[PDB]
Design a protein around this ligand. Structure first.
Ligand SMILES: Cc1c(N2CC[C@@H]([C@H](C)N)C2)c(F)cc2c(=O)n(N)c(=O)n(C3CC3)c12
Ligand SMILES: Cc1c(N2CC[C@@H]([C@H](C)N)C2)c(F)cc2c(=O)n(N)c(=O)n(C3CC3)c12
Ligand SMILES: [Mg+2]
Ligand SMILES: [Mg+2]
Ligand SMILES: [Mg+2]
Ligand SMILES: [Mg+2]
Lengths: 208, 482, 482, 210
DNA sequence: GACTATGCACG
DNA sequence: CGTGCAT
DNA sequence: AGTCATTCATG
DNA sequence: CATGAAT
């Protein structure tokens, strides 16, 4: 299920977590195989705050992540015995894409916090517009246009140019700034209890 | 090449972006036409493409493709499964899509894939789209920015209650059951005349849900509770008969089952009862359903207590279930838990909006023309000098100009006059044009009145509402008790 | 009730229908445009829908659905898979469909489903359809009987040889390899001048196959046999290099592989040689192919006989394989095993029919216009008299009869005059019309000459083929050895 | 895989071998469950006159049609033990419908001839046209007096399936009847055999390309 | 969205 | 075996 | 063309 | 455990 790097190097190597088998393929095809591995997430990733640790373990996407990163899960987790210097979550710049980022992150917080706290978890930002633009702002500079609907409309040449190439890519580094407020936020948005969530949404989401 | 965001920060934007979309634009229906985005697109698209009840069916895949390419930016399976559901008359009380082939069954077996089936809109579906071409409803651009699409349909009948909805978003979910069309309309008509009507009175017209699968609905108190607050547990229970078999044996005979219950799974679950002898006296469970009737036969042993068994089945199977109301819908962009009254009220508000819009449009058209027809009537009176002036003109632009300057035509009249084909000059019958001038005025009067008189408008609304009911009404299927 | 039928007789009737169908309408290409029916519908449909190289891409699903709904009555996987191959530039020498997104690789991994990809016709596809709108090609009713579709495309270039085909029917199969566009055209143009040309001479223009995957083709003698009989067995061997490495170790490097071979399986089947120590010397097998260049590194041990290894691999893997020509195609509705001459002649024949039809069409159009223009020129010298005559008529038909009778205009002229918009009486400029008239007579002449003189027609056929060559020409990719 | 009849009756019970899972479902819905069974054939059926008997007994459909007719296959075939009186082949009226009928027939001939011999193997003729329904271009002209052109079973509702093709009291059936055991062998082998040349020739001699 | 099995002709 | 339109 | 997993709220 | 639009 995993497409691994060519040589083992826990100081360069990178694990790309890609939404969907299809964009999985384009990443497998556009990457630099020497130091870039590909793990396609095929479907919506299990919620690790809501589910039983029993189920969390029996989960394909979840096992192969533990196994591929090879650093153990939860308590028995040693950042030392890792496999990658960077773990990169790459999804469509669409809402379900965001949802997926959300679920992966709650897994990495609840069961590999060290990894997140050590700044090894990143988030690839695919271009929003076609030259390329990421900002409704750059788009103006550029106009002096295909609105991308997901990774699946991108050629492997373009993926690399814009979002896999360390030289040309714009990344997000996920940091834990206030351990207290982070656990609050994660447990609210992703937990078993609905009402705190609804409330959160009413108070925070602007329906207009 | 690298930007830092906090967990609390990213986790926030992401879940917010998603939560919002899933609420406004996925799982929950618009309170006015009772449709979720996917469904609205299915209908609008198929309709734009002339794929209607009076015309031959199209390949399902063709429809699905055009929805995807034009309006809905999501999986084709989502779109098709949506389409197939609108075609299943054991889920929709009034079905919006007619489909040829295997579109599934009450045994929950898989529908033929979109390569096999064909579809058109149902006739009633027509009425959800009625007058869409008259600028009666807000449009917006599609993802492509190549096409405008409607954000809500005209809805010449109140679909949200007739067909219901379910129902799983983030922070909110939905369960609205089907209702009888004639009934919902009687209530709406009443509420038009009596804005401040109370539930107790409304329920005289709209007594309770009417499931396409029929059955028995028990619990007038909880029904009332739901119509008031949008929440309520009610009981739904199978229509049963007791046949006497030879040898002093009896047979329980099921003929209608609860909404959303898989017939085949039921029959199995009942048999598991006979096989484990959880209760005593079941001889054989036997599905006898054919293409034109539902019928499960439970044969009992001689000397089995048939009430004891029937009760066991109602309790420990889905032969009887609890239906939970949970009426959430999208009102003014936001999720809103709502009962019978804000629903009907919103439907009405909407129909008002539509009818005004519709009437402005029609009247705008009759004006534009009535205006041309005056122009022509005058031209005839001075044909000779007008041909003379166009002859003198240096070109179209100048001709229109000379027409305005010398005879006080308006741009629009100028354009009409100047684009007449020569053979018009043969006609000097003004009288016919006057009969038209008259019919147009008359028409505009009636229109303006609607726009400018609230009562006159609402009467229209009622007239039309009753037409719909006369045309599509059918009898109740589900019986009510307490 | 029931009818009796014999096993002998039924098997005959059924397999007869299948056989015929799968032969002429599925698996084998038409000898003229080199397309299987499904390929032709794909192109014709995407073109009808303005899904062309110069316009934006388009959800693959939208396209597939319209194809399925209007023309090709089969699975969508068949249709989408066909459409994908047409976009894969390691299968087609000259791809006919451009496709954004994961449309496979040489490693054979699955292309994104039509849910995900977007497509449009390649620019060259344009030329296969050139003049489709000018009655240059025999049309037929679609299964619906709702829309006519082409039975062959105009083919502005000889696609059968350029992109090849393949190829499994009943009783027949086909394998025709890709060819260099510039070469094929050169051959064609020669044969146009020299109808009786023999293979030896054509091979000075069409030396042999040009795979888009490159490599080395070996067998000048079997190539002739194939170009003559339709069958032949040539050899294809991978392009390789040797790189000297640190430590005095050498390394084999493959940069081109044989047509229709899976890079991924190859590499496995090669590392299996290493692993079974089938030949001595292999350190490591390594795919190093990346988005811009194929590259398989075979690293050897310290003292290893590199010419030994390289040979063993050619012999015992697919680093070298045998391609088999088996050139079957549909000529006059039947399957015909055919070689380079039947093919090109058929192409020429066809291009002859198109250019003739095209010209008949354009001429007729031009005469009609000329006729009108002639009428308008008279009308100007009698503008007023004509206007007066129309005024004096009773209606449109009366006007035309007075035009015919009083000034000897023809029905078609009268209609033109009588349907002019009023503003025209401002542009009363006869010189510019006389200019158009001249331009028109000149055009009609040029066109009449083509229809009336074979050699003039064949010069066009040649002029045009060269325009295409100038525009789409590219270097050979496969090298030839004997 | 199989959908059994409700009551076991070697005298009435019918076996409906239907092309594809979806039309098989449409049939499962419109059948008369008392005596009509349904065994979907999921894609093109194996050519039993071309393949090794090993790979033939490993085949999902073949296996499951031998083991539900319950008479065994080959020499060990006892017509007397069979579980249905009628075996009915129901395919689209399209060309691959034609092809499948071919493939199935060659199976029954080769490995269950007694069945074919006894007049127990039929072919259902679905209607070609709906204006009511018609099966013959001729029958069409009569209906035209007082048009959907069916492209497969896929576009028929169970109601329609039953009314026209599954209802014993309504449907036209074709009864496959071996007239001459000698000619029928040559016919099956030319068309379905492992040898290409004969067949290519047969096509050249018989199929009118126009 | 991957996987699974067939036919048909051909080395 | 593997190819490519079909089921 | 079925099979397989997951999300989200709910009782 | 299902429900039904999504991946
Ligand atoms: C059924 C079936 C299969 N299987 C798997 C088992 C096999 C056995 C022989 N029935 C059937 C199979 F393995 C693959 C397909 C298939 O790819 N595409 N595109 C299809 O449309 N179908 C449907 C038949 C048309 C498939
Ligand atoms: C992947 C996937 C599945 N599975 C089954 C295995 C499971 C693994 C565990 N994630 C993935 C699955 F079981 C079903 C679907 C599916 O129905 N539709 N319509 C889809 O588009 N997909 C693709 C994901 C988008 C499906
Ligand atoms: Mg997406
Ligand atoms: Mg119960
Ligand atoms: Mg070899
Ligand atoms: Mg078919």
């Amino acid at each position: 299920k995993l497409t691994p790097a060519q040589s083992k190097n826990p100081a360069k190597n990178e694990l790309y977590l890609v939404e969907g088998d299809s964009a999985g393929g384009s990443a497998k095809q556009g990457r630099d195989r020497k130091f870039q591995a590909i793990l396609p997430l095929r479907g919506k990733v299990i919620n690790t705050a809501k589910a039983k640790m029993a189920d969390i373990l029996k989960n394909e996407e979840i096992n192969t992540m533990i196994y591929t990163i090879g650093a153990g899960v939860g308590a028995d987790f040693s950042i030392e015995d890792a496999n990658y210097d960077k773990i990169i979550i790459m999804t469509d710049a669409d809402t379900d894409g965001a949802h997926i980022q959300t679920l992966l992150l709650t897994f990495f917080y609840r069961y590999m916090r060290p990894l997140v706290e050590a700044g090894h978890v990143y988030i690839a930002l695919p271009p929003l517009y076609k030259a390329y633009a990421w900002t409704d702002g750059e788009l103006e500079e550029l106009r002096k246009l295909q609105r991308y609907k997901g990774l699946g409309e991108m050629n492997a040449d373009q993926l690399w140019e814009t979002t896999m190439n360390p030289e040309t890519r714009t990344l997000i580094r996920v940091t834990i700034e206030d351990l207290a407020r982070a656990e609050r936020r994660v447990n609210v948005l992703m937990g078993d209890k609905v009402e705190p969530r609804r409330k959160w949404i009413e108070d925070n989401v602007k329906f207009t | 090449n690298i930007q830092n965001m906090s967990l609390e920060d990213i986790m926030g934007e992401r879940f917010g972006r998603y939560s919002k979309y899933i609420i406004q634009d996925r799982a929950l229906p618009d309170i006015r036409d009772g449709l979720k985005p996917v469904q609205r697109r299915i209908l609008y698209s198929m309709n734009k493409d002339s794929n209607t009840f009076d015309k031959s069916y199209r390949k399902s895949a063709k429809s699905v493709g055009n929805i995807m390419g034009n309006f809905h930016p999501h999986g084709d399976s989502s779109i098709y499964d949506a389409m197939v559901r609108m075609s299943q008359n054991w889920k929709n009380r009034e079905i919006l899509v007619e489909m040829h082939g295997n579109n599934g069954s009450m045994d929950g077996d898989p529908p033929a894939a979109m390569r096999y089936t064909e579809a058109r809109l149902s006739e009633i579906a027509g009425y959800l789209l009625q007058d869409i071409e008259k600028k009666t409803v807000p449009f917006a651009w599609n993802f492509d920015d190549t096409e405008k699409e409607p954000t809500v349909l005209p809805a010449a009948f109140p679909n949200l209650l007739v067909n219901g909805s379910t129902g799983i978003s983030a922070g909110y979910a939905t369960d609205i059951p089907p209702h009888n069309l004639a009934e919902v309309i009687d209530a709406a008509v009443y509420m038009i005349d009596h804005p401040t009507a109370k539930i107790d009175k409304l329920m005289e017209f709209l007594p309770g849900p009417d499931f396409p699968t029929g059955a028995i609905i028990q619990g007038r108190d909880e029904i009332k509770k739901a119509y008031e607050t949008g929440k309520g547990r009610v009981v739904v229970r199978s229509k049963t008969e007791i046949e006497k078999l030879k040898g002093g044996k009896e047979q329980i005979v099921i003929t209608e089952i609860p909404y959303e219950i898989n017939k085949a799974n039921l029959v199995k679950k009942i048999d598991d009862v006979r096989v484990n002898n959880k209760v005593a006296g079941i001889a054989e469970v036997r599905d006898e359903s054919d293409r034109d009737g539902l019928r499960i036969a439970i044969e009992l042993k001689k000397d089995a207590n048939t009430e004891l068994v029937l009760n066991y089945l109602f309790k420990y199977t889905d032969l009887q279930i609890n239906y939970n109301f949970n009426m959430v819908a999208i009102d003014n962009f936001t999720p809103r838990q709502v009962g019978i009254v804000p629903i009907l009220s919103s439907y009405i508000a909407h129909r008002r909006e539509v009818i005004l819009a519709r009437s402005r449009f029609d009247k705008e058209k009759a004006e534009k023309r009535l205006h041309i027809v005056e122009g022509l009537i005058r031209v005839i009176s001075i044909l000779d000098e007008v041909i003379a002036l166009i002859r003198a003109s240096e070109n179209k632009a100048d001709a229109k100009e000379n027409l305005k300057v010398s005879y006080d035509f308006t741009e629009e009249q100028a354009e009409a006059i100047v684009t007449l084909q020569l053979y018009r000059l043969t006609n000097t019958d003004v009288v016919v044009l006057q009969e038209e001038e008259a019919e147009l005025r008359e028409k505009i009067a009636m229109l303006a009145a609607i726009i400018g008189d609230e009562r006159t408008m609402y009467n229209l609304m009622k007239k039309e509402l009753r037409e719909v009911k006369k045309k599509f009404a059918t009898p109740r299927l589900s019986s009510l008790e307490d």
